[PDB]
Amino acid sequence: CLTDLVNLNLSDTTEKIIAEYIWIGGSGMDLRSKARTLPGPVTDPSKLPKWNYDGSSTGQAPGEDSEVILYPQAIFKDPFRRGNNILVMCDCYTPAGEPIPTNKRYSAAKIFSSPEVAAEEPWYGIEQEYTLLQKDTNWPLGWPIGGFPGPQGPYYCGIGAEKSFGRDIVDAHYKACLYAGINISGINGEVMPGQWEFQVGPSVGISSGDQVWVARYILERITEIAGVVVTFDPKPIPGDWNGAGAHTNYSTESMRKEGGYEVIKAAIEKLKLRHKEHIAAYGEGNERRLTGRHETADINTFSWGVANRGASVRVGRETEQNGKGYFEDRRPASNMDPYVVTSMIAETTIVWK
Amino acid sequence: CLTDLVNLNLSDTTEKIIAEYIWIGGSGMDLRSKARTLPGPVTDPSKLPKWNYDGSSTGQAPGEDSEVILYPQAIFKDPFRRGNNILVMCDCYTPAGEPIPTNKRYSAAKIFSSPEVAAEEPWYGIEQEYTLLQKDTNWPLGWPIGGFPGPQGPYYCGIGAEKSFGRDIVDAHYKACLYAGINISGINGEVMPGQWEFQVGPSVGISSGDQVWVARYILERITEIAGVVVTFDPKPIPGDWNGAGAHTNYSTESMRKEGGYEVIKAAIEKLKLRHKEHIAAYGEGNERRLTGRHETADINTFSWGVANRGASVRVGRETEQNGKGYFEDRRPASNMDPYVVTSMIAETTIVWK
Amino acid sequence: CLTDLVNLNLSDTTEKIIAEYIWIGGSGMDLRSKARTLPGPVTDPSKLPKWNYDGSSTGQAPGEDSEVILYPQAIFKDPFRRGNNILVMCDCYTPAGEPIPTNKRYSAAKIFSSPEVAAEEPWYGIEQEYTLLQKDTNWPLGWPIGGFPGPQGPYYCGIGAEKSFGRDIVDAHYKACLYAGINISGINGEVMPGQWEFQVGPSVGISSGDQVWVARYILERITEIAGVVVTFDPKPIPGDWNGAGAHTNYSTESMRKEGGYEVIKAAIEKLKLRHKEHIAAYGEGNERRLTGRHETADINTFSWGVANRGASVRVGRETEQNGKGYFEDRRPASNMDPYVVTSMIAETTIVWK
Amino acid sequence: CLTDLVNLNLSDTTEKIIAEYIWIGGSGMDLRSKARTLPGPVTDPSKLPKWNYDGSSTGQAPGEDSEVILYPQAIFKDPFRRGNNILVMCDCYTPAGEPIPTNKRYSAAKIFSSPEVAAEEPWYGIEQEYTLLQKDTNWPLGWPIGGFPGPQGPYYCGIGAEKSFGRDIVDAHYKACLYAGINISGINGEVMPGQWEFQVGPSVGISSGDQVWVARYILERITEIAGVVVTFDPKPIPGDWNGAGAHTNYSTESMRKEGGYEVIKAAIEKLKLRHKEHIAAYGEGNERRLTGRHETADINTFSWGVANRGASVRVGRETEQNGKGYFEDRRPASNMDPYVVTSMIAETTIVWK
Amino acid sequence: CLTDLVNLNLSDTTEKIIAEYIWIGGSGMDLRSKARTLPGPVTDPSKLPKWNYDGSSTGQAPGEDSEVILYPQAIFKDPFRRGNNILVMCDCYTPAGEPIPTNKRYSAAKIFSSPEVAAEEPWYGIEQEYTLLQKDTNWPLGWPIGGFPGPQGPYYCGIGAEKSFGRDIVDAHYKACLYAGINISGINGEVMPGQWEFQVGPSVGISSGDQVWVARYILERITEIAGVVVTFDPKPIPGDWNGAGAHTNYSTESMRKEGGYEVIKAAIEKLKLRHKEHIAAYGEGNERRLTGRHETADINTFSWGVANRGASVRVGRETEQNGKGYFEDRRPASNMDPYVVTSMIAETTIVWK
Ligand SMILES: Nc1ncnc2c1ncn2[C@@H]1O[C@H](COP(=O)(O)OP(=O)(O)O)[C@@H](O)[C@H]1O
Ligand SMILES: Nc1ncnc2c1ncn2[C@@H]1O[C@H](COP(=O)(O)OP(=O)(O)O)[C@@H](O)[C@H]1O
Ligand SMILES: Nc1ncnc2c1ncn2[C@@H]1O[C@H](COP(=O)(O)OP(=O)(O)O)[C@@H](O)[C@H]1O
Ligand SMILES: Nc1ncnc2c1ncn2[C@@H]1O[C@H](COP(=O)(O)OP(=O)(O)O)[C@@H](O)[C@H]1O
Ligand SMILES: Nc1ncnc2c1ncn2[C@@H]1O[C@H](COP(=O)(O)OP(=O)(O)O)[C@@H](O)[C@H]1O
Ligand SMILES: C[S@](=O)(CC[C@H](N)C(=O)O)=NP(=O)(O)O
Ligand SMILES: C[S@](=O)(CC[C@H](N)C(=O)O)=NP(=O)(O)O
Ligand SMILES: C[S@](=O)(CC[C@H](N)C(=O)O)=NP(=O)(O)O
Ligand SMILES: C[S@](=O)(CC[C@H](N)C(=O)O)=NP(=O)(O)O
Ligand SMILES: C[S@](=O)(CC[C@H](N)C(=O)O)=NP(=O)(O)O
Ligand SMILES: [Mn+2]
Ligand SMILES: [Mn+2]
Ligand SMILES: [Mn+2]
Ligand SMILES: [Mn+2]
Ligand SMILES: [Mn+2]
Ligand SMILES: [Mn+2]
Ligand SMILES: [Mn+2]
Ligand SMILES: [Mn+2]
Ligand SMILES: [Mn+2]
Ligand SMILES: [Mn+2]
Ligand SMILES: [Mn+2]
Ligand SMILES: [Mn+2]
Ligand SMILES: [Mn+2]
Ligand SMILES: [Mn+2]
Ligand SMILES: [Mn+2]
Structure with a gap:
């Protein structure tokens, strides 16, 4: 048939x-x-x-x-x-x-073409978190209608029919993306039951945005097949439940080379100064996500730290210990436009002084 | 089994x-x-x-x-x-x-054999829009019984289980048509939820009508497998919901050659004069479709324009800019007999003066 | 599993x-x-x-x-x-x-061995019509329980989920029959919704009966897999709904050769004389079918005609125009024993004078 | 509770x-x-x-x-x-x-006040036919979804769970109307399964229109309790099924007195002359009802007769045999405004010459 | 509500x-x-x-x-x-x-008026057996769909949820009939599961038919309320299941007086002679009921006996022992017209010689 x-x-x-x-x-x-x-x-x-x-x-x-x-x-x-x-x-x-x-690829492409940016050869790893919903009721997958599952705790990277909702979709998406040629670096189940993540692995300049969008396309076509709905809403359920971000990991040529850690702190410093204007372009509804709780920093402060999931920016133990690597911008919402976020980071970080 | x-x-x-x-x-x-x-x-x-x-x-x-x-x-x-x-x-x-x-193939074959028509070697691209219905209730696929989905907007070329209803059938039809040898040029999801479109790509003379009929046969066999119903009714739901046309795209030898655009305007002019008589053969119920709203022109007026989906006839930006190509007759209903429409266009356009 | x-x-x-x-x-x-x-x-x-x-x-x-x-x-x-x-x-x-x-093959084999019959080398094409029923309620496939579909009209050779009920079974049986080595010449959807037909194509003498019985066995085993019931009852639903025949198409050596049409009329003539005694062996319940309406002739009269589906016997336009071919005895009911009908026709047609 | x-x-x-x-x-x-x-x-x-x-x-x-x-x-x-x-x-x-x-009571009140009309003291008996439908599917009560009950015949005035659908509603409405003070003269089950009728018994002038509207109000409130829908559409189901009228029975002082029958024929004569203009005000959609079949007269002809349910106007055997009584105007559709129809009859029949 | x-x-x-x-x-x-x-x-x-x-x-x-x-x-x-x-x-x-x-009351009234009949003052007791069916499937109440309950034996006058189907309806009907003024003499559950009986107790002449018809009306109105169907078909299920009769118990003035038993035998003797002609008027389908089995006598023989439920006519032990009483004509089917049966018995028994 x-x-x-x-x-x-x-x-x-x-x-x-x-x-x-x-x-x-x-x-x-x-x-x-x-x-x-x-x-x-x-x-x-x-x-x-x-x-x-x-x-x-x-x-x-x-x-x-x-x-x-x-x-x-x-x-x-x-x-x-x-x-x-x-x-x-x-x-x-x-x-x-x-x-x-509504074409934001164009500006982004300009910025990535500009020779002092292309020289620096910037790398993006974007962490796309999203939430699966039941069709029609719009209530998260695996949640009882008009009720709640047990509190957060066992769901992050969990296994078992009571902990893990929709792995089908996630695994299918993982392979579909690999087969398509997307540079997908990995997946995990997230903190909120019904919430998942995939990473679009280190990708250079404009191709990062292209890949994230197609990754999204593929995800939604898959949920379609499964009869389920996806939101990229940054905070689909109010209360004591995690929101959804699109953490942007970032490094330049000079950041991944010897004594790169110094360039990193400098870059962070520039980001601190342009916090307000990044927020405005970091996805709508983010006020409902960035509260300082649920592994976010408050929208109004900017902070950074080493293994700190409460901070606006985080630097891995690995890259600290090696004095070179990348850092993680935790501020962007899951509904972020990667073209905008990605190029705006390059611009604040290389071009602007 | x-x-x-x-x-x-x-x-x-x-x-x-x-x-x-x-x-x-x-x-x-x-x-x-x-x-x-x-x-x-x-x-x-x-x-x-x-x-x-x-x-x-x-x-x-x-x-x-x-x-x-x-x-x-x-x-x-x-x-x-x-x-x-x-x-x-x-x-x-x-x-x-x-x-x-009820054999309309015969007349049409006559016209396409006639040597001044054959010389002109006319090309047809027909855009078959249709609507999927739930069996027995006859209510459109994905619509709640005795109710309506959200207003038009997100459905056109959409993805997602809440936006797109029936892709299964559509993709299956696509491949089945290609395998069978039908020159199907493409597919899209239409404006009304549950409404879809496929194109029988540029086909010459009599074989255009043959291919559309077979395309239709295959569609309805597929819906039959899926337990779903199709209408080609040009306006299956009254009110603020799109109807269904069978746009006929058309070009002659002299229209696709240098300075073809002039021949096009000439052809349009002839069509303007025989509007009344085309209407009569453009499928029944068309009065309920051609209202001037929902990307139609009013049945009583005839109009044309460049990128104008409000007009009786539309000419692509592409073919305007190249002074040669084809034009789109938007007037025929989804329940049009492509033999009648296709040949009557050739006749009004080449033979008659 | x-x-x-x-x-x-x-x-x-x-x-x-x-x-x-x-x-x-x-x-x-x-x-x-x-x-x-x-x-x-x-x-x-x-x-x-x-x-x-x-x-x-x-x-x-x-x-x-x-x-x-x-x-x-x-x-x-x-x-x-x-x-x-x-x-x-x-x-x-x-x-x-x-x-x-209850062995009616034996008699039939005798007749088909008898040398003046074997010389004439008789060919049968039997059209087995049958009706699909829902298990337990015994109400036709696709009909609502305690109700009726729309009137006859769209069902004959139709397509679509509202018109065509049980194609699955029919297509499976077609292939099953071919693979088995039955000489099945084709299939169609019949006039009553849920009614269908297959033809056991030109088969010689005793092997016609053998093949029809096995074709029936294969059908009922398929319906069993599908959880559906079959009747060969000649008139499963009273009123304005078609009954079910097993039309027997017939031709001898001399009928398919030059000026065969004359032999045909002669044969028909002999059939006219033994109408009463054929009826008695043409399946039980046939009084409920042969009423002169719904493409039957009345049980009491015998008639014949060229393209006449109201007659007891019909001769194809094709075989008239070529003055040679076969004729259709429309009298046998769907529950006919093909051994009895097939051999009795040979006997009334060759042996008896 | x-x-x-x-x-x-x-x-x-x-x-x-x-x-x-x-x-x-x-x-x-x-x-x-x-x-x-x-x-x-x-x-x-x-x-x-x-x-x-x-x-x-x-x-x-x-x-x-x-x-x-x-x-x-x-x-x-x-x-x-x-x-x-x-x-x-x-x-x-x-x-x-x-x-x-949209206030048609006003005009009607004027006409019934006018002294040559009030003198004649006109009586109306209106027969309100209507159809019960299943909520959401809008398919008649008692009909199987996407199917049809057996043909008309047993339903008119019938009894039994298979013949009679919705008596609950009808009997409740009967009593509710009597208790309210409506002069309801009786009820019957109609020809089409799911279709019923009540009569607002002989009522004078303006109170006829008032009482029919309130009877309608009561009906629809009762159906609302039962979770069922009513249409007054004159032909809710196409094909071989009765439509719904609101026959208007009429008599004046001089029609119910000795030799009233002569006044009746004269009145009928005046109605014949104003048929066109009555039709226009006799409820919309009437063209789909008045076909000459299903106990209607064709919209285009006007006719009358004694026990003739094929006619535009019918006179009872009872009133013929007594040379005095009333007649029945069968033309008005069930969605008729009784203020308009009722007064228009008085006007064509008394005032106009 | x-x-x-x-x-x-x-x-x-x-x-x-x-x-x-x-x-x-x-x-x-x-x-x-x-x-x-x-x-x-x-x-x-x-x-x-x-x-x-x-x-x-x-x-x-x-x-x-x-x-x-x-x-x-x-x-x-x-x-x-x-x-x-x-x-x-x-x-x-x-x-x-x-x-x-179709008015059979008229003839019957004539017969019961005729003075030599009225003098004899004839009494009828009719035993109306009937069967309750599930709506739509038309399969007897309490029977599993496409299946059969346990064999006959426990159902006749039985009690319990597995034995007795529909008492609700029966007890309702009993009271309703008494309240209405019908001379209902009693009820019982019959041999076939879902089959029941009531008696319209000794009624004189024409009023017997009147009362039976009204009792029937009341029954079917009650079944309507319950959502169940009734047949008066004499043999609703083929095979080893009882059919349904309308036994007619009968006595005249002279049969209930001293030495009435002699009159009884004389009457039975007259009935023997007109068996054929009574059968023809005793309800259609009776051939399927009167088989000699399931407490019937074969249609073709006439017999009588004392406590004999296999006979065409039975005389109670009670009336034998008292040499006066009534007898039971067991021949009429449940779909008998009581007007016809009742009067025909009076005629064969009193008038004719
Ligand atoms: N030098 C780098 N610059 C930018 N991105 C990198 C670099 N190295 C690795 N990445 C990417 O950053 C992302 C890290 O994702 P993840 O491991 O999910 O973050 P976290 O450890 O906070 O969950 C991956 O997509 C990874 O391939
Ligand atoms: N010169 C031409 N003449 C006829 N058909 C053409 C020509 N060029 C393209 N086509 C065909 O016309 C159809 C294009 O319609 P479509 O893709 O649905 O555009 P739109 O939706 O804007 O009307 C296709 O069948 C395409 O192959
Ligand atoms: N000469 C013949 N003798 C016997 N059978 C024949 C002959 N010619 C064709 N047939 C067969 O008779 C049958 C025709 O059946 P069908 O097309 O169903 O009849 P209908 O004309 O009633 O549609 C097929 O088996 C066909 O192969
Ligand atoms: N003289 C009269 N004038 C007006 N209406 C009358 C007169 N006599 C009876 N009626 C009314 O006419 C209506 C008859 O309707 P109905 O019983 O439905 O008749 P039918 O079904 O035969 O057309 C009732 O409301 C009845 O009360
Ligand atoms: N003399 C009589 N004449 C007519 N009917 C009588 C007479 N005596 C009793 N009956 C009626 O005969 C019927 C007997 O019915 P039932 O008791 O069902 O008979 P059975 O014993 O055959 O089941 C009752 O209607 C009873 O009132
Ligand atoms: C587990 S989490 O810290 C939580 C992310 C949170 N949903 C947010 O709002 O960013 N994401 P990750 O640890 O993969 O960086
Ligand atoms: C979106 S539509 O313009 C709308 C056609 C509409 N259904 C009609 O009735 O013509 N189809 P297309 O854009 O392919 O020409
Ligand atoms: C369409 S019909 O004429 C239907 C005949 C009907 N079922 C009968 O012969 O009883 N059969 P066919 O067209 O194959 O001869
Ligand atoms: C039985 S009918 O004749 C049918 C009326 C039909 N519905 C009509 O007027 O279209 N109604 P009535 O007997 O009340 O006049
Ligand atoms: C038990 S029976 O004899 C059964 C009668 C059966 N239904 C019939 O007469 O067909 N009825 P009753 O005992 O009242 O005469
Ligand atoms: Mn992560
Ligand atoms: Mn995460
Ligand atoms: Mn992270
Ligand atoms: Mn298109
Ligand atoms: Mn389109
Ligand atoms: Mn188009
Ligand atoms: Mn055939
Ligand atoms: Mn056939
Ligand atoms: Mn045939
Ligand atoms: Mn009436
Ligand atoms: Mn009526
Ligand atoms: Mn009426
Ligand atoms: Mn009894
Ligand atoms: Mn009994
Ligand atoms: Mn009895």
């Missing part, structure tokens, strides 16, 4: 290829996509045709002047259609070639 | 083949089919025997003179029975060789 | 074979079977041992003298057990070598 | 009274109501205070000028709250004393 | 009365009724108005000449509406005063 058809191997019958064009909609947080047939395999982004879509259905264009343009930027293998089919992360433009206001 | 037998590979046991003969029934909108065993593989339509059926059971002949004749016209591979089995799009005649009144 | 064991491939472990001996029970309408292990593959009926069964449990013998004897007559591949396992159509005899009263 | 409170007898504790003010909403077909406490029992309409409501929530006034005024016209006992509590049929006016466009 | 309204006591608010007019429809076996409001209490049939109904909806008149007339013949108290409300058993006529073909 139905999976026989979804899983048909096309290679036996044509050279033709399906490409799923993915872009970001009007809200800056909604992923959209559609698919087209291409005459054969393609491995290079610039050999893919540009395309358009109805921007008036995605809050990005008026009905009378409706076309918005898609620029292929990155190709991944499609873990759903498989074979030689592909996913294509895109970028949005007016027909005149202007980037639309 | 049951899928073991449905999916038996016959190649291991005979050379015999199964052919599913498909035709259009008394309503002009109802697909019918039955199957016969043939001695071996066949790749050419004209090497298939003719056949008949009981026309008195399909509203096409009286009981006393019941036989109606099937002319094989197009062969595709059967994505359900797989192996060497085939689907066979047919054409209906009286035993005297007359095309019956 | 359970299908892993049912689908075990025995070829990897022994040369041993399973043979399912099929026979006809005390009612003349009830198929029975049991299975024995045989030392290795067998392709010829006469190399299979005879066997017996408890006739006192099938209405065919008393308890004190309970053994009845099975004579292998035809071999087919077992589509259930697969590998080298086989189904074996049988014939029933007293231990003294007498055919039992 | 809950019925203990709904059924509390207030007479034991205060003299206070609850009055439910009923009026007709912006669509002219939607009943609305609210309740207020009054210091003691009231038996005369003119001793009740006027009141208002938010017209902007009923499509009868803008938000900035929202008040619409209610004029008490008739009092009935409240069968729900019981005791001395009352229902109050109302009339709607601008604060300036203008009747609003 | 709903029973509060159905059970409203109207005596507190008007003198008005509800009268349910009951009649027999086109099949001769289907009860019909509707209700009208009357100005006050009525105890005498001849003071009730005649009425009519739509005969074209009950198979008793054409649409163009649709009125059929109802003559009140007997009054009973209405056990559903209670208070002073009434049931009214009616008789059907053309507007010309002719009894319609």
